Structures are given as C-alpha cells and as structure tokens.
Paper text:
XPB is part of the general transcription factor IIH (TFIIH), which is functionally divided into core TFIIH and the CAK complex. Analogous to the stimulation of XPD’s helicase activity by p44, the enzymatic activity of XPB is also regulated by its binding partner p52 (6). We pursued the structural characterization of p52 from the fungal model organism Chaetomium thermophilum (ctp52) using x-ray crystallography.
We solved two crystal structures of ctp52. The ctp52_1–321 model comprises the NTD and MD1 domains and the ctp52_121–514 model the MD1, MD2, and CTD domains. Both crystal structures were superimposed via the MD1 domain (rmsd of 0.87 Å) thereby generating the full-length ctp52 model. The ctp52 structure is predominantly α-helical and consists of 22 α-helices and 15 β-strands.
Residue numbers in the entry: 10 to 71, 79 to 165, 176 to 240, 254 to 319
The structure:
C-alpha cells in the first residue's frame, strides 16, 4: 500500500543507487514482486541475452490473470528495461541480486550478532513493553491534537508536523491540531503506522537535501530492510555497522525500532517493529 506508492514515485537514478546493494534488491525482490514476477525475473537473470517475449510467454503457462499486472510491477520499479523483442535487466540489479542469491554479499553488511553477555532482564517481554510504550507515546501525542468540543522526543513532534499528520494552530494550547492525514494515520494497523512514519523520516531528509543544496533516503531504506532480517531478543554489535548506520541508531531508538542499554552501547537490540517491517 505505502512502500509501493513511495517507490512508484522514485526516479530511475535512485533505483540504480539502491540496487548497488544486494540486501536491498533481494529484499524488494523477496517482498514486493508477486509470485509470477519472481519466476519471470529468475529466468531473466539466468538466460544469456535480452531474449524473446514469446519465450517469456512459454515461461508463463498457468492463473493466466496476472500475466499483465506482473509486467507493470516489473516495468515501474527495477531498471529491467525492454524494447519489443528485447527485455534487458539493469547491470546494477542483476549484479546485486546475483551476489544475494549466491550468498556472496559483504560479510559485514548483515546484523553481526555480539559475543557480549545479554542482560538476563532484556527478554522479548522487555523489548515488547519498551517498543509498545514508545509507540503509545507517539499515538497519544497525535491523539492529544483531536479537538475536545511530556509525550515523545522533540525530533518526532517536528517529523509529524513536517509530515502534516499535525498542523500548527493559533487557538490551541498545544499550538498544534490534527490533520485528516493524522486521523487516517491513527486508524492504520501498527505495521502501516510504522511505515507511515519511517517514509516521512525518509521524505524529510529529501525535503532537507533539496534545500541544503541551495544520510540519503536510499541508505536509510537499505538499513531498514537489514533490520527486518535480524532476530528478536538477540543483541547485535554496534561497531560492525557503517558510520552512516551508527549515525541512524538515535532516530530508530526515538521510533522504538531499537533498544540500546546505557550500560553497554556496543550491542543494539531490534524490537518486534524492526523485524516485522518487510513481513507486513
């Protein structure tokens, strides 16, 4: 619904930057492309030259409903461009997806688990309370902007404001009132709610870059996919991340996708919000 809509707006140049990254290409591939599109793309990545449409039809076989829809989804997202009789895949996407399917991606590009002992008090229950309360607060905030005829971190308020889930208002003590977006946002399922905010967190950095040209969204998104491949209740090693990702842990903590302990900022714990992402 949301990620798809977001992606359908992205210009080619970004897609090819995003597909410098196996995990990304493989994540999209895995959990955007429908059962058939996968099948079509597999063969396509394997076969020698930009082959014949008719041969892809011979690949199709049964059921025979999505034969059209599958062409569109493929057409919009990847850099898998074609001209009648010829249907190519973009080097970047090919190269990226291959490495992924051959499990030959950088060793240090995944959630490196941590050797350090795990505080007995940090269980799935803790990591659920934490995350839950974190989201409670955000939801309470956007709620407390509904006319009545502390809350979250300042960085989130400003993000909701920028996102137009909330609008500045002269009348109200808060200085803030709910938008129709905000209403819609409040009705969405906890998954859709997290994506709604994350996509804003992304757009924000574009809206910034654009001006600041008087990390990029792609880096932020890649990392998100990574966090969706990690395991819940397991501690991961901070140092193994790239500077750009070490530099995103605060935002994701604010959002409740990550617990750090104060005791040891060598181990980051993804919450259920982080691992669910792509499975929803």
């Amino acid at each position: 619904y949301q990620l798809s809509d977001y992606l359908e707006k992205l210009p080619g140049t970004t897609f090819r930057k995003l597909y410098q990254q196996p995990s990304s290409a493989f994540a999209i591939f895995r959990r955007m492309l429908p059962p058939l599109a996968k099948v079509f793309v597999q063969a396509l990545l394997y076969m020698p030259q930009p082959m014949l449409l008719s041969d892809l039809d011979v690949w199709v076989r049964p059921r025979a409903l999505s034969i059209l829809r599958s062409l569109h989804i493929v057409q919009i997202t990847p850099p898998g461009k074609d001209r009648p009789q010829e249907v190519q895949l973009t080097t970047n996407f090919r190269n990226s997806l291959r490495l992924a399917l051959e499990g030959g991606a950088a060793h240090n590009s995944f959630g490196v688990p941590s050797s350090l002992p795990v505080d007995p008090r940090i269980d799935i229950a803790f990591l659920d309370n934490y995350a839950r309360k974190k989201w409670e607060d955000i939801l309470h905030y956007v709620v407390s902007s509904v006319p009545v005829h502390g809350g979250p971190k300042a960085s989130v308020k400003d993000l909701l404001l920028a996102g137009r889930l909330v609008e500045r208002r002269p009348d109200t003590k808060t200085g803030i009132g709910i938008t129709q977006a905000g209403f819609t946002f409040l009705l969405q399922e906890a998954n859709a709610q997290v994506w709604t905010l994350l996509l804003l967190w992304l757009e924000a950095a574009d809206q910034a870059k654009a001006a600041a040209a008087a990390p990029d969204s792609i880096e932020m998104l890649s990392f998100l996919f990574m966090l969706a491949s990690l395991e819940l209740g397991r501690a991961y090693d901070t140092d193994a991340l790239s500077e750009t990702r070490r530099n995103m842990l605060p935002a994701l903590v604010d959002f409740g996708l990550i617990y750090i302990p104060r005791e040891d900022t060598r181990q980051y714990f993804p919450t259920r919000l982080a691992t669910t992402l792509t499975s929803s």
